[PDB]
TrEMBL record:
Residues included from the entire protein: 24 to 42 of 42
Name this polypeptide is given: Uncharacterized protein
Length: 19
């Protein structure tokens, strides 16, 4: 859920980096 990173759920809808 941000401008860039990795899929939040699984399909790339949201892009955050997270722990």
């Amino acid at each position: 859920g941000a401008f860039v990173g990795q899929p939040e759920a699984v399909n790339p809808l949201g892009r955050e980096i997270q722990g």
